[PDB]
Design a protein around this ligand. Structure first.
Ligand SMILES: NC(=O)c1ccc[n+]([C@@H]2O[C@H](COP(=O)([O-])OP(=O)(O)OC[C@H]3O[C@@H](n4cnc5c(N)ncnc54)[C@H](OP(=O)(O)O)[C@@H]3O)[C@@H](O)[C@H]2O)c1
Ligand SMILES: O=C(O)COc1cc(F)ccc1C(=O)NCc1nc2c(F)c(F)cc(F)c2s1
Length: 316
């Protein structure tokens, strides 16, 4: 396997990164420190995760120790939905930079294609529980993202949770300055994303797979819901390789030429999840895992399904 993938800006992105959603502030500093010690050099962050200060604490220190150089790290963050207005984007980026204690990001993503009413609340809802949109559009937000590159705050920009028509909207802009470098999307054996991956890869956009373990800690998970980590078929593939099910689930997107960002705050799991460069899934394993697709999406909200830019009404 090679360990980084080339982006359109000429930078190389590590194919394995550490996710940080639901890594509690009081626990994430140690998580990130351990991750850097064991070899992670890509960290996936976001303003909405409410922990960027504590991630930043960890990074800055591993600099203070001389454990890693900033140029070796690949730090990703994301513009939250309440900041899609062109005049709010730079301040949102700068807040993330200040929290992370960094002078640039390697990649900055539009977190979702949906703009929400600006304000303090991450999820402004009306009295009936529907998200309150903003009067923003993908192209104007993208133009504001491009200014961040031209000001040196971020090295690359991309998107997350965009369907292929939303990607196309950006690509087709006459005055496009920067193509998206990455589309970060949910991807795992129960939601294999064959058509969107094919589309993105054909357009020279790198795909990052989020929730590769099925996000078992997501707050809306129902006890009856499928569980990747407990799937006995995946356990049997893992046993054949004397690996864990998590290790199989991480290796799987890597062999599809995807980037993958498993989350853990547990030191013993952070280290296990990185030990995926010493084995390969066979062609039969890959085919088998792909065959588990059920088009089963875990990361979506009912409250957002009426937004004009809700991404998941389209087939892909
Ligand atoms: N762009 C977006 O809209 C978006 C959406 C979702 C996710 N993401 C990103 O993708 C990252 C990964 O997705 P995710 O956090 O949803 O879920 P995930 O990585 O699929 O699963 C994380 C869960 O698996 C557990 N776990 C980790 N390693 C394990 C192992 N070796 N054995 C058993 N359990 C293990 C974790 O527990 P502990 O932490 O307690 O160890 C945690 O509960 C996020 O953290 C975030 O950075 C982005
Ligand atoms: O982002 C993470 O890592 C994990 O996710 C989350 C992370 C957080 F820190 C808080 C909430 C979520 C969450 O509720 N996620 C589900 C969504 N679905 C939608 C949706 F369908 C939209 F059309 C717009 C939108 F913005 C969302 S957010």
């Amino acid at each position: 396997m090679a360990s980084r993938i080339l982006l359109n800006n000429g930078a190389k992105m590590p194919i394995l990164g550490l996710g940080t959603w639901k890594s509690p502030p009081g626990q994430v500093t140690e998580a990130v420190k351990v991750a850097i010690d064991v070899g992670y050099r890509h960290i996936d962050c976001a303003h909405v995760y409410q922990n960027e200060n504590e991630v930043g604490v960890a990074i800055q220190e591993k600099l203070r120790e001389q454990v890693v150089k900033r140029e070796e790290l690949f730090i990703v963050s994301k513009l939250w939905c309440t900041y899609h207005e062109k005049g709010l984007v730079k301040g949102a980026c700068q807040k993330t930079l200040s929290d992370l204690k960094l002078d640039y990001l390697d990649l900055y993503l539009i977190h979702w294609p949906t703009g929400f009413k600006p304000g303090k609340e991450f999820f402004p809802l009306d009295e009936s529980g529907n998200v309150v949109p903003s009067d923003t559009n993908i192209l104007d937000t993208w133009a504001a993202m491009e200014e961040l590159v031209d000001e040196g705050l971020v090295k690359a920009i991309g998107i997350s949770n965009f369907n292929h028509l939303q990607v196309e909207m950006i690509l087709n802009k006459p005055g496009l300055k920067y193509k998206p470098a990455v589309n970060q999307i949910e991807c795992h054996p129960y939601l294999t994303q064959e058509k969107l991956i094919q589309y993105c890869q054909s357009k020279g956009i790198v795909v990052t797979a989020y929730s590769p373990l099925g996000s078992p800690d997501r707050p809306w998970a129902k006890p009856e819901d499928p569980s990747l980590l407990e799937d006995p078929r995946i356990k049997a593939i893992a046993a054949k390789h004397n690996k864990t099910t998590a290790q199989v689930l991480i290796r799987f997107p890597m062999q599809r030429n995807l980037v993958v960002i498993p989350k853990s705050v547990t030191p013993e799991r952070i280290a296990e999840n990185f030990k995926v460069f010493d084995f390969e899934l066979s062609s039969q394993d890959m085919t088998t895992l792909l065959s588990y697709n059920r088009n089963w999406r875990v990361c979506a909200l009912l409250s957002c399904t009426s937004h004009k830019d809700y991404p998941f009404h389209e087939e892909f």
